[PDB]
Amino acid sequence: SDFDLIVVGSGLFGLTVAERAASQLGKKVLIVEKRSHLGGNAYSEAEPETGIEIHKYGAHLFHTSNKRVWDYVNQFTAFTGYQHRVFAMHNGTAYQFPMGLGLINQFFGRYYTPDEARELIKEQSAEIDSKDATNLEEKAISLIGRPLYEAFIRDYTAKQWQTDPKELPAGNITRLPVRYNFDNRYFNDTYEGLPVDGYAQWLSNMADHENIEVRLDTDWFEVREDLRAQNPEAPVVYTGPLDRYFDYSEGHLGWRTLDFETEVLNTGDFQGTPVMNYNDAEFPYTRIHEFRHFHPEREDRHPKDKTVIMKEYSRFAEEGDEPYYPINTPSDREMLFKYRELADAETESGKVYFGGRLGTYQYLDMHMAIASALSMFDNKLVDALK
Amino acid sequence: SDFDLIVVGSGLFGLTVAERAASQLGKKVLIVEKRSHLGGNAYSEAEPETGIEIHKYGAHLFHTSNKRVWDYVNQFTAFTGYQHRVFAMHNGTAYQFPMGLGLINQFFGRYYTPDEARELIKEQSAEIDSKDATNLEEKAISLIGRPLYEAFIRDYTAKQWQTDPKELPAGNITRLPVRYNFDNRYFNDTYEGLPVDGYAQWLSNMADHENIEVRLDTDWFEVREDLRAQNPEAPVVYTGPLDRYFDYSEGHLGWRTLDFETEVLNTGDFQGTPVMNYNDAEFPYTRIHEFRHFHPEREDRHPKDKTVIMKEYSRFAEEGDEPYYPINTPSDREMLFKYRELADAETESGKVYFGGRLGTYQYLDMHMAIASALSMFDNKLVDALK
Ligand SMILES: Cc1cc2c(cc1C)N(C[C@H](O)[C@H](O)[C@H](O)COP(=O)(O)OP(=O)(O)OC[C@H]1O[C@@H](n3cnc4c(N)ncnc43)[C@H](O)[C@@H]1O)c1[nH]c(=O)[nH]c(=O)c1N2
Ligand SMILES: Cc1cc2c(cc1C)N(C[C@H](O)[C@H](O)[C@H](O)COP(=O)(O)OP(=O)(O)OC[C@H]1O[C@@H](n3cnc4c(N)ncnc43)[C@H](O)[C@@H]1O)c1[nH]c(=O)[nH]c(=O)c1N2
Ligand SMILES: O=c1ccn([C@@H]2O[C@H](COP(=O)(O)OP(=O)(O)O[C@H]3O[C@H](CO)[C@@H](O)[C@H](O)[C@H]3O)[C@@H](O)[C@H]2O)c(=O)[nH]1
Ligand SMILES: O=c1ccn([C@@H]2O[C@H](COP(=O)(O)OP(=O)(O)O[C@H]3O[C@H](CO)[C@@H](O)[C@H](O)[C@H]3O)[C@@H](O)[C@H]2O)c(=O)[nH]1
């Protein structure tokens, strides 16, 4: 055959499945991608004026405590020692972030020892018992009190979900969001970095194999019947939109989206930190990314006097807009459960597997997706190709 | 012979010289150490109540951009991903540190962009031209202005050197101490961590070799004539006090010292950061070290409800007191230059080499010492043992 496996999509999920099949089974794998680039939403490319790497589908920071995934992805790229950190902009002052002794000192006026700070939160959050809460506004206040809630959460949350906190489930926060030390790593995980020569280089390396064929700029639904004709019992992995596979026969799945406003400024340094959250409602966007800071080890290939930055906005996502975050209304999660039924049928009837962010209506971190792929590979695909 | 090389001292300098001679030349090396422990001032040991590693000769953070040294020391111990960070305590508020957009925001009331902040420092430091300064107080103010100087430098400096800034050379600061971003790594170097099983374990590994013999609790001047008798043209490396070698025949070298006040507290967490500087004169000590935080990856072998901390004080150092920092008065640096003459004579007449912190009256970082040793090894010792 020309191929033994067809993979729809070239996000981390497709790529992984693909590469395993190529290197571990030695099969011929054909990757079909709609866009003109490899990588799915993880893709990054250089801004033309400045040369600086940016991400046209949202900023991507790689982090995992999953050693399996880590050793794996390191097979295809090295990482930097980048540790992600964030600052929160509120009333013209940049606060340390997330919530901890640092922010606490800046906001309530003076230093609180760890023990002091636990107590400070005790009194503040005493208003509502977490067992009481009816919506998102309460449940937070019940965890950290009104002063903090109103300053750092209320508007930020509102902007991100286009809504009032009072009209959101209480179940969306599940943990005390406060640290009683000065540690402001944003992420708790074992391993963390950025791909050394960027994501594009990395993603691309995953498909650079003597058994993988990649057709960019190709829609699967336009070429499916043709390709399956060439070798009919070659199986498919579909990482595209779940609902669309089944021609929305059952209602459109509901997604949240993002609009990105990307400017080049005539300064070498606009905020001196990669990410700057904006928590006051006076501003449309949720945060400003300044991309040079993600790779400071490159700042000798960077513009002395220019910098690229990007403002992130949120809204609901519909048609033509890129889907980013599943919304998961109740009326979404059953039309899902339903499509599951369809997919399984379709998986047994016609050897077509469903995976990844779009393919399962589900938020996935990068390592999550990669693992999800590796699961499917080992559990479903090894026997499916014998 | 029983030994081919005698090494006085077991600090990093001795150890290095020793280990190279043992592993690269295969010589028999006898290490003579006055204290009862291996390691010199780098040594660390567990506080008995809590089990927590501490440093009885000052806190030690390892950091280098010298790859040679790095690959070397990794031969004897692994390091953690510890990045050192510091906070400055001034008027009951803990400031981000060192001086940068962060501290700046906290102190002058609101966020300053990088460009804004450069300008802010322009006006502040405009008072005195750096070309003018007569003492340490001016030279700082000429670099960062009075508001900052007085808040974060004046008292801290005074405590550390027991003096008024106005009576210190202008040459002790040589660089703008301000960052125009939010990056608060304390150290600029390529590599940085803490020894995984502590320094004691590490240091000790360097002497664990089938050609190295270690006699703890032995003063060299008490046993020298004896040992050199056993094999008279076996050479010595002396890493002890330079002046004392030559029986202070030429004036006592002047050192600064430290007194450490070490307490165990009945709390799991006293300040939630490894180091907390204290910049106001209301406090005797310069900073408080809280040692559990140096190894957070151990906090599941740490006391749930106790923590060891330590307050650091400075003064001048004399006899019986441990020497820490060369003072380098003018009347010190010529009595030095002189002892150099003596040493070289003594090096040619009697094959006795002088090295390391004490042996050269000179502040040395760990990697500096190690490199200094490696220099001496390759340049003077290889031919000296043929
Ligand atoms: C804003 C934002 C930011 C981040 C993240 C998500 C979001 C939304 N993620 C990273 C990322 O979005 C996610 O992990 C991956 O995109 C999932 O990879 P997939 O293969 O599952 O989907 P992905 O969407 O990447 O791949 C799908 C591919 O299929 C193609 N395709 C679709 N329909 C097709 C059709 N009909 N025919 C052919 N091709 C078709 C698409 O063109 C696309 O290339 C993340 N995770 C993390 O761990 N850390 C982070 O910091 C971030 N950052
Ligand atoms: C407070 C403080 C903090 C730090 C540092 C210094 C100070 C003062 N240094 C680390 C350290 O102090 C320095 O790098 C080493 O001690 C130098 O190693 P040496 O072998 O040169 O001397 P060192 O003093 O360690 O070794 C001398 C040894 O010789 C022995 N001795 C002396 N006289 C003798 C005699 N007559 N006979 C026999 N034995 C004798 C002593 O007992 C001792 O064991 C540092 N560096 C860095 O890179 N990062 C850091 O964070 C720090 N931290
Ligand atoms: O300043 C802040 C930050 C967060 N939040 C709340 O916490 C949530 C966290 O969202 P956000 O800070 O915007 O994004 P992350 O937590 O960094 O990441 C989200 O998106 C990432 C990439 O898209 C995924 O890796 C994460 O799982 C997902 O939580 C927000 O919706 C808010 O409800 C605030 O109120 N204020
Ligand atoms: O809060 C601060 C910190 C520093 N300084 C000034 O900067 C100097 C720096 O000294 P200090 O902060 O006490 O120590 P380090 O810079 O961390 O380290 C000193 O001691 C270390 C270990 O002993 C060595 O690695 C360094 O080379 C040596 O500069 C001080 O004397 C002051 O003059 C201030 O004014 N305020």
Ligand code: NA
């Ligand atoms: Na409560």
Ligand code: NA
């Ligand atoms: Na000036």
